[PDB]
Write a protein that binds this ligand. Structure first.
Ligand code: VO4
Length: 283
């Protein structure tokens, strides 16, 4: 709460969106933190595990797999609210490729993650965005020694909710995951409907479990993923009457996974949404 009140930070944000200063400061923020090594992601055996050749995890915050081939394009992203004894944990990752679905489910299993948030359709205007790593009901899939079954599938206008049963085939052990797929948010763009987006972020927040990471991905794992992380962080701050500086939220994300929030229009969108949530909270 140190630099301003919440009220003051919102007046600053509103004034700066109108004047242009908020986007000028965004444009000057580094997209990749200089000084953080990126080496494992570039190793010859890992190149085909990256959906986009230059969207890569930092060494220090990459998610490790157990075994001989430890690599997945995934990053730990933890958002602190220090004035509240609160850290919101995420794993930010890409949409799996046909041959990385086994590693994707390995992360879910190893960490017993109960919530996956997918922010892309499988394809867009003829371009592949994500491999379908879950079965249609009532098919089954096997990925890397995990048997996957869809127990329910409930569509809404903006998103699909699926309950997935993950079974370790070698031991019979079972784990249930809630899978949320937001289908109304195009790549490098903003949500088709701002109200649907905010309801969805609410819903995600309601499913978060204490001290367990939420796995979030789009196609590359940085743009729409970064907007969601920024929004959830801001909602936590406004409810606690703590000041919100979106530029610092984005910087804190980018120190953990490069390039989060890809476009200036995405940033403008999330800043406007933050002002809306704030104003609604005053009511
Ligand atoms: O698939 V995302 O381009 O929004 O990182």
């Amino acid at each position: 709460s140190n630099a301003d009140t919440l009220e003051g930070s919102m007046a600053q944000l509103k004034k700066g969106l109108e004047s242009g200063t908020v986007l000028i400061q965004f444009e000057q923020l580094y997209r990749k933190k200089p000084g953080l090594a990126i080496t494992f992601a570039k190793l010859p055996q890992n190149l085909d595990k990256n959906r986009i050749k230059d969207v890569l995890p930092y060494d220090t915050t990459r998610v490790l797999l157990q075994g001989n081939e430890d690599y997945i394009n995934a990053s730990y992203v933890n958002m602190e609210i220090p004035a509240a004894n609160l850290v919101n944990k995420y794993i930010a990752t890409q949409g799996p490729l046909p041959h990385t679905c086994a590693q994707f489910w390995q992360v879910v299993w190893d960490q017993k993650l109960s919530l996956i948030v997918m922010l892309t359709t499988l394809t867009e205007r003829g371009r592949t965005k994500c491999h379908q790593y879950w079965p249609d009901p009532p098919d089954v899939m096997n990925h890397g020694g995990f048997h996957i079954q869809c127990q329910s599938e409930d569509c809404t206008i903006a998103y699909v909710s699926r309950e997935m049963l993950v079974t370790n085939t070698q031991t019979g052990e079972e784990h249930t995951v809630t899978h949320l797929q937001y289908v109304a948010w195009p790549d490098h763009g903003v949500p088709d409907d701002s109200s649907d987006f905010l309801e969805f972020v609410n819903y995600v927040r309601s499913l978060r479990v204490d001290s367990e990471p939420v796995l979030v991905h789009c196609s590359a794992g940085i743009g729409r993923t970064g907007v969601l992380v920024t929004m959830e962080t801001a909602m936590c701050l406004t409810e606690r009457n703590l000041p919100i500086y979106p530029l610092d939220i984005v910087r804190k994300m980018r120190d953990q996974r490069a390039m989060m929030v890809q476009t200036s229009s995405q940033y403008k969108f999330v800043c406007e949404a933050i002002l809306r949530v704030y104003e609604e909270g005053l009511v």
